[PDB]
């Protein structure tokens, strides 16, 4: 059933999510977590290669025809190990963990009506032995901008998301939005790589593209409005100005000179110097006596 048939952009202020489930309002809160660095280089695919997961992944897509359906997460991505398959279908989202034997080039086989806004499934060509986890819920679903954050902590695969309309042709929006918790999956698997799954028709696809960035352990200053919504954030590592704001715990800095940090030259290499003695110690003569 298997078929054997990048550019870079700038993530201005995207990739910020609510770090926990605590309600806060009218407050500036400092938090440390895995966030997408501001003004970073995000890989742009138009393409369904296997990418590294690293510490965490920021995944965004822009499409009109719902071509991107899901993702595969794991290591070897074959029958040898457990892997996570997240796929949206006609009515629901199916999340499974099994020893799946994936196709060399996995996808959903879908055909379209005469009306280009309607489709029906023909087949499934993605791969399911020794299943340990199964979950079903509602679908994860002007162009549609869908942003996801994927984290894997202590066996939990945490998904954050945001779905908004976009009026741009081929890029990410220059503005701020916070992503909300979607689901927390108690899976307990090892994820090092992942792949994006598309719905193709007899195979080609319509116009769609997606962006992949990576999260880093950084400190952010988050601004909560009166409704408990994050409206702004500062990446404290971005520049000396941001560092000052994070130090003062304010989004405004007055004229003057401020001490913000201490610089330190780091060690270039490590050296070890022990004696030029070679003989081994006579412990054997004590214990084997």
């Amino acid at each position, epitope marked *: 059933q298997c078929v054997n048939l990048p550019a870079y952009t700038n993530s201005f202020t995207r990739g910020v999510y609510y770090p926990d489930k605590v309600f806060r309002s009218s407050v500036l809160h400092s938090t440390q977590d895995l966030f997408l660095p501001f003004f970073s280089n995000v890989t742009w695919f138009h393409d369904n290669p296997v990418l590294p997961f690293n510490d965490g992944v920021y995944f965004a897509s822009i499409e009109k025809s719902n071509i991107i359906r899901g993702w595969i997460f794991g290591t070897t991505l074959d029958s040898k190990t457990q892997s996570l398959l997240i796929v949206n279908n006609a009515t629901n989202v199916v999340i499974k963990v099994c020893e799946f034997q994936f196709c060399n080039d996995p996808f959903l086989d879908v055909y379209y009506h005469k*009306n280009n*806004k*309607s489709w029906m499934k023909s087949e499934f060509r993605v791969y399911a032995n020794n299943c340990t986890f199964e979950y079903v819920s509602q679908p994860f679903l002007f162009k549609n901008l869908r942003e996801f954050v994927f984290k894997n902590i202590d066996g939990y695969f945490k998904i954050y998301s945001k779905h908004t309309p976009i009026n741009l042709v081929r890029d990410l929006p220059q503005g701020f939005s916070a992503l909300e918790p979607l689901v927390d999956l108690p899976i307990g698997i090892n994820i090092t790589r992942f792949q994006t799954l598309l719905a193709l028709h007899r195979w080609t696809a319509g116009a769609a593209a997606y962006y992949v960035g990576y999260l880093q352990p950084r400190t952010f200053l988050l601004k909560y409005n009166e409704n408990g919504t994050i409206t702004d954030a500062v990446d404290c590592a971005l520049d000396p100005l941001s560092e000052t704001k994070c130090t003062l715990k304010s989004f405004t800095v007055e004229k003057g000179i401020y001490q913000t940090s201490n610089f330190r030259v780091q060690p270039t290499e490590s050296i070890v110097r022990f004696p030029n003695i070679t003989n081994l110690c006579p412990f054997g003569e004590v214990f084997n006596a």
Partner: antibody
Amino acid sequence: QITLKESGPTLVKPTQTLTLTCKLSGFSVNTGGVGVGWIRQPPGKALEWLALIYWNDDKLYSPSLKSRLTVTKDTSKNQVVLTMTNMDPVDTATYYCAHVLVWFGEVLPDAFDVWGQGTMVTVSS
Amino acid sequence: SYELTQPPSVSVSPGQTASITCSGDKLGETYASWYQQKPGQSPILVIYQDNKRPSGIPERFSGSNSENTATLTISGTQTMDEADYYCQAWDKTIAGFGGGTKLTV
């Protein structure tokens, strides 16, 4: 396999309301992509579509008959029920229920693959 | 309901090809389907989505849909193919069946 069985009154009087039940097996009414339609065929006449219900409780009715047709589904018994009110002698026909193939995205009816055996209903005094 | 017109009957000799037409207003935009009904029996789907057969349907049955006209063709028509043939088309959720074509052999 997939099968559907019609049951209900085979005789009603004029101005009375008829209730027909379609008992189905091989699939559930709660399953995504599932739909069940009702069609009638008067003696010696062509088939006329009445209504169909989707797994998501969305419903379609024939504009000319809509005012007299109500369709609901029993999510526990896997049954589809069609209510037709204010029947006249001219409404005599054989009634069938059948499975509906459904397009996704913009949801639309496609074709009826599996049909039941049907039940004959007469309207008379 | 959606307007759909069929010929009242078709008559062929055994071994010949039968052709049953179906005319509508928007058959060039939507999909057509065909059902074969024998006397005393429920109709069986023969063609769906213009030219696709359900499993179990003989290769004798084919069809097409162009210029707002749909057709069903039976190649090598057998005496067992005698039936009332009906066409159906959906106009954006609006159902309709043709009057039915009586095919004899």
